[PDB]
């Protein structure tokens, strides 16, 4: 007992079992439960951990830069951004064989390399990077940035330099600075870099650090900015027949609103992006002088929360008392931040594929598919984390006496109504979506597919017609010249936006049929059900009819035993762990829909998706079975193609999914008795009882069982879908 490994937990130190290791790792960064610690020390640890997480981020992207510059084909991809595939990193596996080495030599390399699906090649070509030396100096610069962030993490944790507790609680100054500096002037610097480097590099002019301060970004030269003649910047935009690498068809425009996409590369214009980031910069800087700093002007957040109480008792006490609730509870801010960042990540996924911001990204189908899948899975995981940390806020730091009668007390008051209505809408959506899918499958099975129920998505089709899509007909806005929306700005972005939205080749507002409507309603079912699970966990986190004293048991406790009928999976942590399954299913649905629709669009057989997504047998056969032919043929007794690694990691993901089932179905007691028998076997044998364990082997805890099963389940899910997605999108496309 009293081992040194759990130094943050005396109770875990006196644990003569293997669980002391496991709980010594899972409770590593839960500083609120660490013994003998205060709020100021917790805040300082938070600051140091944030600096470390940032340093790790910068190290990872610096390593990506270095492993693209070294053992890569960035210059060859710059010369030919269509034919030659990007290279992620070289392969040095001594377990490889000669056919494995010969099959993995792609992209004109001297050895086995991995084809990059991250999209760094398109991004770095768009922002102006062309040579490997630029990537090298960028990698060493970001390594230095990570080094000084390590310096910051060490230095701000040192004595006499640790910030005070109230320093982190300065909400108004932090909001003002992170609105003005972290967002505003950062975007201003980014659009300045865009104007100085990327637009001339997209116009065939090399702008480096050596020739910096001697090449004018605009021929007028900053006098339109002073004189207010800002239309001189939007005077000579790039023509339609403009080459991205060269200066043919070029123009002189740094800021413009040329809507749509660049015809040569099917991507957003560089001047459009520069103007966007400049407008975002000035708007953020303007918004960053709202809150009350040490000067005599500004806004107090607590006063705004006090004032916004509706009259006649509509919201009771209103938003009063919420300022101390947000400031005192780190988990409230954590949940809000994770929810907003998840929503932003979902927005990034939903807007990158339809509006490709990087040159030659729409042609790279595997890259776009991997980026969308990664962003949606990250978004779903961190929305689940947002709701979980909201439940943690409700259990740990929530004083009903402080915020009495406010919106939080009111949503705790009618939490049963909210949970019941969410359960109703989830039941309705699931019942009728499955009923329609089964009806369509049975109808298609009987040989007469015209009996199936096909509801045309008239709402979203009318929305797309209101935004420029004339294929559905109608006479809404942005489709008739007599509409005020069409007449407003008819020479600003509609001549490009309508051209981009009326083309069916790109992913901008694709044509949607009844199968699209059915899968969107299934997505709505997934979102509503995951929300229902998460808010049932969060609202019943501190109490329930079965467990009134759930606040006294913490956030993560196994059960209360077999009494009162059975109480397993009653904590909010278990509700989160079920909602992880439901979120995985939901993101699997959205990625299945995206992958199948885009695969049918790239193959040109959009009618196959239109007439095959109606029934689930079409999903199983034309998507899961048809596109898996090249994946499973990566290695076989006949030979091996370049997709052998994808087949191997596909089987790997199926196996880790199976091990998740291993940890999920069985709970504790069989393993405890089996470990007891193994302990007797080890203790009562010659030649092996001399060596003894320092910590007693025990079965993993029920909370640990759920965590390990969830981790194996999610790892297998992610690896399986990534394997299938990349293999199917790369075996038939380039």
């Amino acid at each position: 007992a009293t081992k040194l490994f759990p130094k943050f937990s005396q109770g875990l130190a006196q644990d003569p079992s293997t669980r002391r290791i496991w709980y010594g790792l899972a409770t590593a960064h839960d500083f609120e439960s660490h013994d003998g610690m205060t709020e100021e020390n917790l805040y300082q640890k938070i600051f140091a951990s944030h600096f470390g997480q940032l340093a790790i981020i910068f190290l990872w992207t610096s390593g990506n830069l270095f492993h693209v510059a070294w053992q890569g084909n960035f210059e060859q991809w710059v010369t030919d951004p269509i034919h030659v595939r990007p290279i992620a990193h070289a392969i040095w596996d001594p377990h490889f064989g000669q056919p494995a080495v010969e099959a993995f030599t792609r992209g004109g390399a001297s050895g086995p390399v991995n084809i990059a699906t991250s999209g760094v090649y398109q991004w770095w070509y768009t922002i102006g990077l062309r040579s490997n030396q630029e990537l090298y100096v960028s990698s060493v610069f970001l390594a230095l940035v990570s080094a000084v962030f390590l310096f910051a993490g060490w230095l701000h944790l040192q004595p006499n330099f640790q910030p005070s507790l109230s320093w982190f609680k300065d909400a108004e100054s932090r909001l003002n600075h992170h609105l003005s500096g972290l967002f505003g002037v950062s975007s201003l610097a980014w659009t300045g870099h865009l104007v100085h480097v990327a637009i001339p590099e997209s116009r065939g002019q090399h702008v480096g650090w050596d020739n910096f301060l001697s090449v004018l970004p605009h021929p007028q030269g900053l006098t339109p900015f002073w004189s207010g003649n800002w239309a001189a910047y939007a005077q000579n935009p790039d023509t339609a027949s403009h080459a991205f690498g060269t200066a043919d068809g070029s123009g002189t425009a740094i800021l413009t609103f040329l809507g749509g996409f660049h015809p040569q590369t099917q991507s957003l214009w560089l001047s459009d992006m520069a103007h966007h980031h400049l407008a975002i910069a000035v708007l953020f800087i303007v918004a960053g002088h709202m809150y009350r700093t040490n000067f005599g002007i500004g806004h107090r957040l607590e006063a705004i929360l006090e004032a916004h109480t509706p009259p006649a008792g509509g919201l009771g006490a209103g938003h009063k008392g919420l300022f101390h609730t947000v400031n005192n509870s780190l988990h409230f801010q954590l949940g809000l931040a994770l929810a907003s960042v998840g929503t932003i990540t979902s927005l990034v996924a939903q807007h990158m594929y339809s509006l490709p911001p990087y040159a030659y990204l729409a042609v790279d189908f595997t890259t776009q598919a991997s980026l969308y899948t990664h962003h949606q899975y990250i978004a779903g995981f961190i929305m689940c984390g947002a709701f979980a940390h909201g439940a943690i806020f409700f259990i740990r730091d929530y004083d009903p006496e402080q915020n009495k009668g406010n919106v939080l007390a009111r949503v705790l008051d009618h939490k049963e109504a909210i949970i019941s209505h969410l359960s109703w809408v989830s039941l309705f959506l699931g019942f009728h979506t499955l009923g329609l899918y089964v009806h369509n499958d049975v109808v298609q099975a009987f040989g007469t597919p015209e009996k199936q129920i096909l509801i045309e998505p008239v709402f979203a089709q009318w929305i797309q017609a209101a935004q420029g899509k004339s294929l559905y007909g109608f006479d809404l806005l942005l489709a008739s010249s007599s509409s005020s929306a069409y007449s407003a700005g008819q020479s600003l972005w509609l001549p490009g936006w309508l051209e981009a939205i009326n083309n069916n080749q790109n992913s901008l507002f694709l044509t949607i049929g009844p199968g699209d409507f059915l899968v969107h309603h299934a997505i709505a079912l997934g979102l509503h059900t995951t929300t229902l699970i998460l808010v049932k966990g969060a609202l019943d986190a501190r109490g329930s009819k079965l467990m009134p004293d759930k606040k006294d048991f913490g956030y993560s406790f196994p059960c209360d035993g077999p009494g009162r009928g059975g109480t397993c999976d009653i904590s909010a942590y278990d509700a989160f762990y079920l909602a992880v399954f439901w979120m995985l299913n939901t993101i699997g649905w959205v990625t299945f829909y995206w992958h199948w629709k885009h695969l049918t669009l790239w193959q040109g057989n959009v009618s196959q998706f239109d007439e095959s997504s109606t029934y689930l047998m079409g999903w199983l056969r034309d998507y899961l079975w048809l596109n898996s032919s090249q994946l499973i043929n990566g290695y076989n007794p006949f030979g091996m193609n370049s997709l052998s690694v994808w087949a191997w990691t596909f089987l790997f993901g199926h196996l880790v999914y199976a091990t998740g089932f291993m940890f999920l179905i069985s709970w504790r007691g069989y393993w405890q008795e089996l470990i007891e028998t193994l302990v007797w076997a080890h203790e009562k044998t010659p030649l092996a009882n001399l060596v003894y364990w320092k910590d007693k082997p025990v079965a993993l805890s029920i909370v640990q069982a759920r965590l390990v099963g969830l981790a194996h389940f999610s790892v297998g899910y992610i690896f399986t879908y990534a394997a299938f997605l990349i293999a199917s999108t790369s075996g038939r496309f380039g």
Partner: protein
């Protein structure tokens, strides 16, 4: 600058064999250490 041609032939063996071994040895000493 540019790493030599034997850099993949050298660096992957440390981080695959002897760096996890050193880390596992240090962690195994850390777990079982008593005061």
């Amino acid at each position: 600058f540019v790493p030599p041609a034997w850099a993949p032939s050298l660096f992957v063996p440390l981080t695959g064999l002897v760096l996890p071994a050193i880390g596992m040895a240090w962690a195994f000493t850390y777990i079982q250490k008593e005061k």
